[PDB]
Amino acid sequence: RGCARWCPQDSSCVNATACRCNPGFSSFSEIITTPMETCDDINECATSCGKFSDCWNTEGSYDCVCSPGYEPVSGAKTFKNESENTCQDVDECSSGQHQCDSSTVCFNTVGSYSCRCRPGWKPRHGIPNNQKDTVCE
Ligand SMILES: C[As](C)(=O)[O-]
Ligand SMILES: [Ba+2]
Ligand SMILES: [Ba+2]
């Protein structure tokens, strides 16, 4: 029809005297009729991203991301639903991404990894075996 100039932040005119929140935002009424009304971000993460992932809420949207220790097989850094989820555990030992001390051997775990002595070396004082910072002698 026409276009109200006074639409509040995150809403768009639907005609000369009314607005509607943009996708991803909500207001008390389905149709906004005054500039005092507000369009608040909807937290999609509190309403499924699938395995090994986290949901991060944003303004007007949200993103699923593989959790730390996992990475998408498909390469996509962000996704929207379980159907697009390609997160798999990162094998830090095979990939050489681990930061183990030359005195230990990397041992892959799901979501993480650790470093162990060689089971003839022994851990230096104050540091347990089977940790990322393990150092032996
Ligand atoms: C693997 As999840 C989306 O429950 O943090
Ligand atoms: Ba949002
Ligand atoms: Ba792992």
PDB file of C-alpha atoms and ligand atoms in Angstrom:
ATOM      1  CA  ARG A   1       0.000   0.000   0.000  1.00  0.00           C
ATOM      2  CA  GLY A   2       2.010   2.939   1.400  1.00  0.00           C
ATOM      3  CA  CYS A   3       4.966   3.054   3.851  1.00  0.00           C
ATOM      4  CA  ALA A   4       5.039   4.286   7.473  1.00  0.00           C
ATOM      5  CA  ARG A   5       8.257   6.216   8.150  1.00  0.00           C
ATOM      6  CA  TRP A   6       8.232   5.647  11.893  1.00  0.00           C
ATOM      7  CA  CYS A   7       8.713   1.868  11.980  1.00  0.00           C
ATOM      8  CA  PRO A   8      10.835   0.818  14.940  1.00  0.00           C
ATOM      9  CA  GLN A   9      14.266  -0.755  14.620  1.00  0.00           C
ATOM     10  CA  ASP A  10      14.137  -4.235  13.088  1.00  0.00           C
ATOM     11  CA  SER A  11      10.687  -3.804  11.559  1.00  0.00           C
ATOM     12  CA  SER A  12       9.499  -2.816   8.071  1.00  0.00           C
ATOM     13  CA  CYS A  13       6.444  -0.913   6.906  1.00  0.00           C
ATOM     14  CA  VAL A  14       3.561  -3.069   5.684  1.00  0.00           C
ATOM     15  CA  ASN A  15       1.472  -0.031   4.712  1.00  0.00           C
ATOM     16  CA  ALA A  16       0.985   3.667   5.485  1.00  0.00           C
ATOM     17  CA  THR A  17       0.091   3.071   9.149  1.00  0.00           C
ATOM     18  CA  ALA A  18       1.605  -0.270  10.143  1.00  0.00           C
ATOM     19  CA  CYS A  19       4.791  -2.304  10.429  1.00  0.00           C
ATOM     20  CA  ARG A  20       5.856  -5.878  11.060  1.00  0.00           C
ATOM     21  CA  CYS A  21       9.050  -7.169  12.674  1.00  0.00           C
ATOM     22  CA  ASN A  22      11.653  -8.497  10.254  1.00  0.00           C
ATOM     23  CA  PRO A  23      12.340 -12.250  10.213  1.00  0.00           C
ATOM     24  CA  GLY A  24      14.080 -13.378  13.400  1.00  0.00           C
ATOM     25  CA  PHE A  25      12.483 -10.670  15.567  1.00  0.00           C
ATOM     26  CA  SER A  26       9.272 -10.611  17.546  1.00  0.00           C
ATOM     27  CA  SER A  27       6.801  -8.100  18.958  1.00  0.00           C
ATOM     28  CA  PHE A  28       3.828  -8.498  21.283  1.00  0.00           C
ATOM     29  CA  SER A  29       1.328  -7.756  18.491  1.00  0.00           C
ATOM     30  CA  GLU A  30       1.566  -9.336  15.050  1.00  0.00           C
ATOM     31  CA  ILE A  31       1.103  -5.874  13.549  1.00  0.00           C
ATOM     32  CA  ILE A  32       2.899  -2.826  14.965  1.00  0.00           C
ATOM     33  CA  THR A  33       0.863   0.391  15.018  1.00  0.00           C
ATOM     34  CA  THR A  34       3.015   2.809  17.074  1.00  0.00           C
ATOM     35  CA  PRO A  35       6.746   3.589  17.174  1.00  0.00           C
ATOM     36  CA  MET A  36       6.846   2.701  20.897  1.00  0.00           C
ATOM     37  CA  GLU A  37       6.500  -1.007  20.100  1.00  0.00           C
ATOM     38  CA  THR A  38       9.678  -3.066  19.885  1.00  0.00           C
ATOM     39  CA  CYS A  39      11.006  -5.912  17.769  1.00  0.00           C
ATOM     40  CA  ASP A  40      13.193  -8.124  19.942  1.00  0.00           C
ATOM     41  CA  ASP A  41      15.654 -10.708  18.673  1.00  0.00           C
ATOM     42  CA  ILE A  42      14.366 -14.255  18.880  1.00  0.00           C
ATOM     43  CA  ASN A  43      16.857 -16.637  20.462  1.00  0.00           C
ATOM     44  CA  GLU A  44      16.582 -19.628  18.138  1.00  0.00           C
ATOM     45  CA  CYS A  45      19.055 -21.538  20.327  1.00  0.00           C
ATOM     46  CA  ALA A  46      16.570 -21.667  23.217  1.00  0.00           C
ATOM     47  CA  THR A  47      13.635 -22.980  21.167  1.00  0.00           C
ATOM     48  CA  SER A  48      18.653 -28.949  16.547  1.00  0.00           C
ATOM     49  CA  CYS A  49      22.199 -28.498  15.240  1.00  0.00           C
ATOM     50  CA  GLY A  50      22.954 -32.226  15.506  1.00  0.00           C
ATOM     51  CA  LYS A  51      26.024 -34.105  16.714  1.00  0.00           C
ATOM     52  CA  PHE A  52      29.195 -32.421  17.982  1.00  0.00           C
ATOM     53  CA  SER A  53      27.914 -28.885  17.496  1.00  0.00           C
ATOM     54  CA  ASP A  54      26.944 -25.722  19.328  1.00  0.00           C
ATOM     55  CA  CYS A  55      24.195 -23.192  18.586  1.00  0.00           C
ATOM     56  CA  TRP A  56      25.209 -19.533  18.712  1.00  0.00           C
ATOM     57  CA  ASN A  57      22.457 -16.903  18.747  1.00  0.00           C
ATOM     58  CA  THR A  58      22.909 -13.719  16.669  1.00  0.00           C
ATOM     59  CA  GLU A  59      20.814 -10.613  15.878  1.00  0.00           C
ATOM     60  CA  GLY A  60      18.170 -11.665  13.378  1.00  0.00           C
ATOM     61  CA  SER A  61      19.613 -15.186  13.089  1.00  0.00           C
ATOM     62  CA  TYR A  62      21.787 -17.917  14.627  1.00  0.00           C
ATOM     63  CA  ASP A  63      24.518 -20.310  13.549  1.00  0.00           C
ATOM     64  CA  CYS A  64      25.297 -23.931  14.312  1.00  0.00           C
ATOM     65  CA  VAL A  65      29.037 -24.594  14.456  1.00  0.00           C
ATOM     66  CA  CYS A  66      31.038 -27.752  15.114  1.00  0.00           C
ATOM     67  CA  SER A  67      32.163 -27.788  18.760  1.00  0.00           C
ATOM     68  CA  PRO A  68      35.838 -27.339  19.634  1.00  0.00           C
ATOM     69  CA  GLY A  69      37.721 -30.545  18.775  1.00  0.00           C
ATOM     70  CA  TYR A  70      35.424 -31.244  15.811  1.00  0.00           C
ATOM     71  CA  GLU A  71      35.452 -29.869  12.269  1.00  0.00           C
ATOM     72  CA  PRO A  72      33.033 -30.124   9.348  1.00  0.00           C
ATOM     73  CA  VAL A  73      33.814 -32.823   6.779  1.00  0.00           C
ATOM     74  CA  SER A  74      31.949 -30.670   4.235  1.00  0.00           C
ATOM     75  CA  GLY A  75      34.109 -27.631   5.063  1.00  0.00           C
ATOM     76  CA  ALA A  76      31.146 -25.310   5.814  1.00  0.00           C
ATOM     77  CA  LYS A  77      32.098 -23.293   8.926  1.00  0.00           C
ATOM     78  CA  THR A  78      28.481 -22.547   9.874  1.00  0.00           C
ATOM     79  CA  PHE A  79      25.183 -24.410   9.302  1.00  0.00           C
ATOM     80  CA  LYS A  80      21.489 -24.242  10.227  1.00  0.00           C
ATOM     81  CA  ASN A  81      20.194 -27.716  10.937  1.00  0.00           C
ATOM     82  CA  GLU A  82      21.114 -31.319  11.684  1.00  0.00           C
ATOM     83  CA  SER A  83      20.695 -32.181   7.999  1.00  0.00           C
ATOM     84  CA  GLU A  84      23.641 -29.903   7.119  1.00  0.00           C
ATOM     85  CA  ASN A  85      25.815 -31.193   9.988  1.00  0.00           C
ATOM     86  CA  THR A  86      29.161 -32.726   8.870  1.00  0.00           C
ATOM     87  CA  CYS A  87      31.078 -32.383  12.148  1.00  0.00           C
ATOM     88  CA  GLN A  88      33.590 -35.162  12.860  1.00  0.00           C
ATOM     89  CA  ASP A  89      36.250 -35.503  15.552  1.00  0.00           C
ATOM     90  CA  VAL A  90      39.610 -33.977  14.607  1.00  0.00           C
ATOM     91  CA  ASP A  91      42.404 -36.569  14.937  1.00  0.00           C
ATOM     92  CA  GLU A  92      45.039 -34.252  16.395  1.00  0.00           C
ATOM     93  CA  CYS A  93      47.678 -36.999  16.460  1.00  0.00           C
ATOM     94  CA  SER A  94      47.383 -37.874  12.744  1.00  0.00           C
ATOM     95  CA  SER A  95      47.006 -34.239  11.702  1.00  0.00           C
ATOM     96  CA  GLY A  96      50.035 -33.156  13.744  1.00  0.00           C
ATOM     97  CA  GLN A  97      47.905 -30.344  15.192  1.00  0.00           C
ATOM     98  CA  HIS A  98      48.613 -31.499  18.753  1.00  0.00           C
ATOM     99  CA  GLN A  99      51.216 -29.680  20.863  1.00  0.00           C
ATOM    100  CA  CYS A 100      52.703 -32.711  22.648  1.00  0.00           C
ATOM    101  CA  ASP A 101      56.231 -32.628  24.055  1.00  0.00           C
ATOM    102  CA  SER A 102      58.855 -34.534  22.096  1.00  0.00           C
ATOM    103  CA  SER A 103      59.150 -36.659  25.238  1.00  0.00           C
ATOM    104  CA  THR A 104      55.630 -38.111  24.825  1.00  0.00           C
ATOM    105  CA  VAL A 105      53.315 -39.682  22.242  1.00  0.00           C
ATOM    106  CA  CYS A 106      50.002 -38.116  21.183  1.00  0.00           C
ATOM    107  CA  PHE A 107      46.894 -40.176  21.993  1.00  0.00           C
ATOM    108  CA  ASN A 108      43.669 -39.223  20.221  1.00  0.00           C
ATOM    109  CA  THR A 109      40.429 -38.889  22.184  1.00  0.00           C
ATOM    110  CA  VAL A 110      36.944 -37.904  20.988  1.00  0.00           C
ATOM    111  CA  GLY A 111      36.743 -34.129  21.194  1.00  0.00           C
ATOM    112  CA  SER A 112      40.341 -33.918  22.386  1.00  0.00           C
ATOM    113  CA  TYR A 113      43.682 -35.666  22.748  1.00  0.00           C
ATOM    114  CA  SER A 114      46.457 -36.186  25.259  1.00  0.00           C
ATOM    115  CA  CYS A 115      50.168 -36.930  25.490  1.00  0.00           C
ATOM    116  CA  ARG A 116      51.598 -39.995  27.222  1.00  0.00           C
ATOM    117  CA  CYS A 117      55.111 -41.091  28.195  1.00  0.00           C
ATOM    118  CA  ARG A 118      56.759 -43.904  26.076  1.00  0.00           C
ATOM    119  CA  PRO A 119      55.872 -46.383  28.392  1.00  0.00           C
ATOM    120  CA  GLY A 120      59.466 -46.478  29.549  1.00  0.00           C
ATOM    121  CA  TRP A 121      59.863 -42.706  30.160  1.00  0.00           C
ATOM    122  CA  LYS A 122      58.306 -41.245  33.353  1.00  0.00           C
ATOM    123  CA  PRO A 123      56.462 -37.975  33.959  1.00  0.00           C
ATOM    124  CA  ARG A 124      58.470 -35.064  35.350  1.00  0.00           C
ATOM    125  CA  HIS A 125      57.549 -33.951  38.883  1.00  0.00           C
ATOM    126  CA  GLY A 126      54.324 -31.893  39.224  1.00  0.00           C
ATOM    127  CA  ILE A 127      52.812 -32.911  35.852  1.00  0.00           C
ATOM    128  CA  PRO A 128      50.515 -35.920  35.473  1.00  0.00           C
ATOM    129  CA  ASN A 129      50.810 -38.386  32.589  1.00  0.00           C
ATOM    130  CA  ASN A 130      48.009 -38.353  29.995  1.00  0.00           C
ATOM    131  CA  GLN A 131      47.558 -34.572  29.672  1.00  0.00           C
ATOM    132  CA  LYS A 132      48.221 -32.089  26.866  1.00  0.00           C
ATOM    133  CA  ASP A 133      51.087 -30.609  28.878  1.00  0.00           C
ATOM    134  CA  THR A 134      52.603 -33.908  30.008  1.00  0.00           C
ATOM    135  CA  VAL A 135      56.402 -33.919  29.845  1.00  0.00           C
ATOM    136  CA  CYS A 136      58.459 -37.002  30.674  1.00  0.00           C
ATOM    137  CA  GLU A 137      62.069 -38.080  31.169  1.00  0.00           C
TER     138      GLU A 137
HETATM  139  C1  LIG B   1      26.196 -31.564  20.475  1.00  0.00           C
HETATM  140 AS1  LIG B   1      25.101 -30.109  21.277  1.00  0.00          AS
HETATM  141  C2  LIG B   1      24.163 -29.104  19.836  1.00  0.00           C
HETATM  142  O1  LIG B   1      24.015 -30.742  22.255  1.00  0.00           O
HETATM  143  O2  LIG B   1      26.186 -28.969  22.237  1.00  0.00           O
HETATM  144 BA    BA B   2      18.803 -14.378  16.572  1.00  0.00          BA
HETATM  145 BA    BA B   3      40.053 -36.377  18.804  1.00  0.00          BA
END
